[PDB]
Design an enzyme around this catalytic site. Structure first.
Site, PDB file in Angstrom:
ATOM      1  N   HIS B  43       0.820  -1.215   0.000  1.00  0.00           N
ATOM      2  CA  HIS B  43       0.000   0.000   0.000  1.00  0.00           C
ATOM      3  C   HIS B  43       0.854   1.266   0.000  1.00  0.00           C
ATOM      4  O   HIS B  43       0.359   2.348  -0.302  1.00  0.00           O
ATOM      5  CB  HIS B  43      -1.013   0.012   1.155  1.00  0.00           C
ATOM      6  N   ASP B  99      -0.447  -7.325   2.148  1.00  0.00           N
ATOM      7  CA  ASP B  99       0.140  -6.011   1.960  1.00  0.00           C
ATOM      8  C   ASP B  99       1.648  -6.181   1.881  1.00  0.00           C
ATOM      9  O   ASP B  99       2.362  -5.949   2.858  1.00  0.00           O
ATOM     10  CB  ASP B  99      -0.241  -5.126   3.143  1.00  0.00           C
ATOM     11  N   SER B 199       4.671   2.605   7.727  1.00  0.00           N
ATOM     12  CA  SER B 199       4.235   1.487   6.887  1.00  0.00           C
ATOM     13  C   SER B 199       5.375   0.906   6.058  1.00  0.00           C
ATOM     14  O   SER B 199       6.292   1.626   5.640  1.00  0.00           O
ATOM     15  CB  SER B 199       3.095   1.917   5.966  1.00  0.00           C
TER      16      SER B 199
END
Ligand SMILES: *[C@@H]1O[C@H](CO)[C@@H](O)[C@H](O)[C@H]1NC(C)=O
Ligand code: NA
EC number: 3.4.21.5
Lengths: 30, 253, 29
Positions: B43, B99, B199
Site C-alpha cells: 500500500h 500487503d 508502513s
C-alpha cells in the site's frame, strides 16, 4: 546522476506523506 | 512511531527509507533482505482510492540512515529501483490483505556497520516466536502521533504480539491469516504503535536459538495510531515467504 | 544471506542494545 557533493539537490526539509494504512475503518480523516 | 525512543546507531541496519523523487517526501519504511532486494508494504506503492500508483522511476531508497532529514555522508547509500513486484492478490479494497511488495535495486548495495540484511523466518522460528505476549520491535521515521509530529531520528518501539481473537474483536474490519496484530492492551499501562510513514517497515524479533534478527512482520495497517483498545496490524511474513522466494528466484537473486 | 540478522555494531562485537533484553524477557517470563 550522483556521486557525493552533488547531493546538494537533496532536500533536508520534506514532509511525510499521508499514509492510507492508518486511515482504514475508524481511522478515517476528513 | 508513537511513544517510542530514538534508535541507537546501527540498531536496525536493515531499515530502509522509501523516498519520493518529485516532490521529495518520506513515503514509507522498508527492509533490506539481501544486497539487491528490499521488502515493503504494497500500500506504500499502490492505493487506487488515493490515486497512488508509484513505478520504479518515481522512487529512491535510502539505506543506512539514522537522521530522518540529513544527508548522511559516508554512511547512507542511495539506490534506484530496477523493478517493483506487488503481490497479485494484495487487497487494497478492504483490509490490505497480503500487503507486501518487493523492490529490486539496480546495483547491489555494499554492506557496512550501518547497512546489513535482516533474516526471513523459517517455519520453526515462526512457530516458536509468533506467540501472544512475545514482543517484537518496530522501527521507522513515521509520525510521532495520529494526525507536524515528525521525528529527527529513527524511532524504535518494542510491542507484544496479541491473541488472534482479541485482534479480531478489536476491529470491525475483516482479519485474515496473512496478518497478525501487536501492541499493549488498555490495562497494561505501557503503550506505543506504528503510525503514518512507518508502513512497510519491519517488525523484528531476536531468535534465542541463534541470536539472529528475523523479520516476522511488515507494518501494514491500523485505525489511527496508539488508540486504547486498538492494535497495529502487520503483514505475516512467514505466511508470504513462498511468494517472496518465488519472486526472487524468478527475477534474480 | 548466510550473515543475515547479525548486526556489525552489536552481535558481531558482542554488544547488546539498550532494550533487546526486553524482548528476551518477554519470551521467558
Ligand atoms: C500504475 O501505473 C503504471 C504506469 O503509469 C501503469 O502502467 C499501470 O497499469 C498502473 N497500474 C494499475 C493497473 O493501476
Ligand atoms: Na492500542
Amino acid at each position: 546522476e550522483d556521486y557525493a557533493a552533488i547531493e546538494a539537490s537533496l532536500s533536508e526539509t520534506f514532509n511525510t506523506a499521508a499514509d492510507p494504512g492508518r486511515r482504514l475503518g475508524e481511522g478515517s480523516k476528513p | 512511531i508513537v511513544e517510542g525512543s530514538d534508535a541507537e546507531i546501527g540498531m536496525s541496519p536493515w531499515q530502509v527509507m522509501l523516498f519520493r523523487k518529485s516532490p521529495q517526501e518520506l513515503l514509507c519504511g522498508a527492509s533490506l533482505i539481501s544486497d539487491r532486494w528490499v521488502l515493503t508494504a504494497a500500500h506504500c506503492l499502490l492505493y487506487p482510492p488515493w490515486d497512488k500508483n508509484f513505478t520504479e522511476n518515481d522512487l529512491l531508497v535510502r539505506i543506512g540512515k539514522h537522521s530522518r532529514t540529513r544527508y548522511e555522508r559516508n554512511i547512507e547509500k542511495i539506490s534506484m529501483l530496477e523493478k517493483i513486484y506487488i503481490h497479485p492478490r494484495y487487497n487494497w479494497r478492504e483490509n490490505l490483505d497480503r500487503d507486501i511488495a518487493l523492490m529490486k535495486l539496480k546495483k547491489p548495495v555494499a554492506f557496512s556497520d550501518y547497512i546489513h540484511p535482516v533474516c526471513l523466518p523459517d517455519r520453526e522460528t515462526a512457530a516458536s516466536l509468533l506467540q501472544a505476549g512475545y514482543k517484537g520491535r518496530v522501527t521507522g521515521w513515521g509520525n510521532l502521533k495520529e494526525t507536524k509530529g515528525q521525528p529527527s531520528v529513527l524511532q524504535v518501539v518494542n510491542l507484544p504480539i496479541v491473541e488472534r481473537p482479541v485482534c479480531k474483536d478489536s476491529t470491525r474490519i475483516r482479519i485474515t491469516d496473512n496478518m497478525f496484530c501487536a501492541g499493549y492492551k488498555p490495562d497494561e499501562g505501557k503503550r506505543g504503535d506504528a503510525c503514518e510513514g512507518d508502513s512497510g517497515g519491519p517488525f523484528v524479533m531476536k531468535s534465542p536459538f541463534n541470536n539472529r534478527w528475523y523479520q516476522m512482520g511488515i507494518v501494514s495497517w491500523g485505525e489511527g495510531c496508539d488508540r486504547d483498545g486498538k492494535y497495529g496490524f502487520y503483514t505475516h511474513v512467514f505466511r508470504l515467504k513462498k511468494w517472496i522466494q518465488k519472486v526472487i528466484d524468478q527475477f534474480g537473486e | 544471506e548466510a550473515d543475515c540478522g547479525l548486526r556489525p555494531l552489536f552481535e558481531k562485537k558482542s554488544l547488546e542494545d539498550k532494550t533487546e533484553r526486553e524482548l528476551l524477557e518477554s519470551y521467558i517470563d
